[PDB]
Design an enzyme around this catalytic site. Sequence first.
Site, short mmCIF file in Angstrom:
data_model
loop_
_atom_site.label_atom_id
_atom_site.label_comp_id
_atom_site.label_asym_id
_atom_site.label_seq_id
_atom_site.Cartn_x
_atom_site.Cartn_y
_atom_site.Cartn_z
N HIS A 116 0.74 -1.00 0.51
CA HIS A 116 0.35 0.24 -0.06
C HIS A 116 0.42 1.02 0.04
CE1 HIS A 116 1.10 -0.73 4.40
NE2 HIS A 116 0.99 0.64 4.57
N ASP B 47 1.00 5.21 2.03
CA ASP B 47 0.03 5.88 3.25
C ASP B 47 -1.00 7.30 2.75
OD1 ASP B 47 1.66 3.91 4.43
OD2 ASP B 47 2.91 5.70 5.16
N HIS C 275 4.88 -0.01 -0.07
CA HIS C 275 5.56 -0.75 0.56
C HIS C 275 5.40 -1.98 1.66
CE1 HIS C 275 4.06 2.96 2.73
NE2 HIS C 275 3.87 2.10 3.90
MN LIG Z 1 2.02 2.63 5.83
#
Ligand SMILES: [Mn+2]
EC number: 1.21.3.1
Lengths: 328, 328
Positions: free
Chosen positions: B211, B213, B267
Amino acid sequence: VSKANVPKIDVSPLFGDDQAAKMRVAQQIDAASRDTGFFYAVNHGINVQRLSQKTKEFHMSITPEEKWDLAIRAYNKEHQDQVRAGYYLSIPGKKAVESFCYLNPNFTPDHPRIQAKTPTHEVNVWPDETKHPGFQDFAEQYYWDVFGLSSALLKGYALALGKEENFFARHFKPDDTLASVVLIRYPYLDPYPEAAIKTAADGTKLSFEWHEDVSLITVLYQSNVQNLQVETAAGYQDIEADDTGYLINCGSYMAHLTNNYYKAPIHRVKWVNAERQSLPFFVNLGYDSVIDPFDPREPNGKSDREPLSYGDYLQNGLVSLINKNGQT
Amino acid sequence: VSKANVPKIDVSPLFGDDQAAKMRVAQQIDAASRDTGFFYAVNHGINVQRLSQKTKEFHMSITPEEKWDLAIRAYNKEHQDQVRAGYYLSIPGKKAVESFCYLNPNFTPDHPRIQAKTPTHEVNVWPDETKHPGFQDFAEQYYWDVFGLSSALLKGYALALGKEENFFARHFKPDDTLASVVLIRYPYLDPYPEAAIKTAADGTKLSFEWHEDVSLITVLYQSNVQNLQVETAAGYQDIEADDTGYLINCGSYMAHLTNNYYKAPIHRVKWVNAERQSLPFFVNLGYDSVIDPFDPREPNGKSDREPLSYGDYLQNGLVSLINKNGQT
Ligand SMILES: [Mn+2]
Ligand SMILES: [Mn+2]
Ligand SMILES: [Mn+2]
Ligand SMILES: [Mn+2]
């Protein structure tokens, strides 16, 4: 690299009154939706042959002057009132793809939504009849053809989710639907502009990077050329081509509604130097349409997610994407 | 599997007035953000040691009845007003991770944003003082501590993008910041709920799938664990641990602003069966904050992307994620 499991579901029962047959299709839809999230709709009753023919003609015959006169705001500053509907030009060396997007034919200046200048609603721009006779009439009729098929598919989805048959359909109305058609053209070029080819981390050359569609469901017709890949649990997998059927998949709004029971498949578009076309119909609901979220995995069926009107969802989803490229 | 190039940048200059050294830091930040998208901000001036201790104390001593009493609405149907702030319970057999999230300490019932009942604004819930002496006071100060660090890293980010020093920071204010601190807990379990272990396409066992952030930038402290992986052009690579620095990365808002010149790193989190904790601080601006998108790759620096108010960004970004799991 393996082939993604993308079944061919005979959709015709959805146009009939045989509740029994319908349920069987709903069962097959449900299963595809929970696997790859992609499935072919076959026996949809749409003259897909004329569609490709008239679209190739349009893309090949439109003159640069016209492309510019129909170009959206992102391309031609002059057209402030054109954000979605219009022509998406190619930028030499930077962009190789071109496309023409149009909205609900009922969106005329007399339409209340247009009068009230509600976002996402626009009035379609069309090429000159002398240079493209009958194009508009063909294009608007097609809109209603896919509208017809999609309306049949949405009854399938409601049954698959155990909801009443008109659960979704009741919000798919001709006078206000925000669905859009996009006639995409992938050229053949030599040399092919390097900047127009993005390379995935696994190295794969791509025309378009991964993403989830911004729609309820996407009804796409595409010429017989392999380019799509779905990210499955086994990594990315190619989706077989089929010039006879329509490739169906859910958008992020279905994922939102079903609390992710039916996720929006993440997918990408491989780069293939070959004159081909892609024609998606993004099934969108009304601007004020609101459906309460649910989780079929829960006894109550209740979901913690809060209702989101289609207008807000659509607005946000579109602003997030590259205006110059589009797709919705 | 290789290690990702995560430079250890000395952030001290950012707290000073020496423009020269500041620009030097900026250049480094620019290079990191254009490579892996991750970097260690070292010399931040925060007592990272007391932080892990108090936190460890919190997670080991808080009782289940206390957790239930602090649980958010997605778990405890009773607290209708708790959506972001509060405890996120583990679900026996299905979810092993647990976490406690708190917002801007200034959000009290007198705060206009809380009275107006604006989305994303909540009033923190805290454990009983008698049972957890000084916890609330520690947690609030810490909020202001990392706030100070972030406030300075944002000045560094501004310089790196050729904008004025306060380009971002002028929107990062104590009275209305929507930033959040999440105290994540990774438990040791034997046996470990198979359900809580996701297996990536490449076979790696994961606690959290890939994903980007939902934040402007994420400022993370994590000690004695190596669980992060960044997807680079060479595939996923491990990020080395460092109990003396703060791991910094961009969220999707920075990507939307910079028209993707600073990509939000993709990540994932590797499965580690051991009692560890992670403390991410999500830098969010104010609800009404609007920053004009730009493309450092264009002469005019004009972008196609439209301005997005942070509140809209955040509301939508949060709803896309699973309420039970969180992170932001
Ligand atoms: Mn994250
Ligand atoms: Mn004109
Ligand atoms: Mn798509
Ligand atoms: Mn209670």
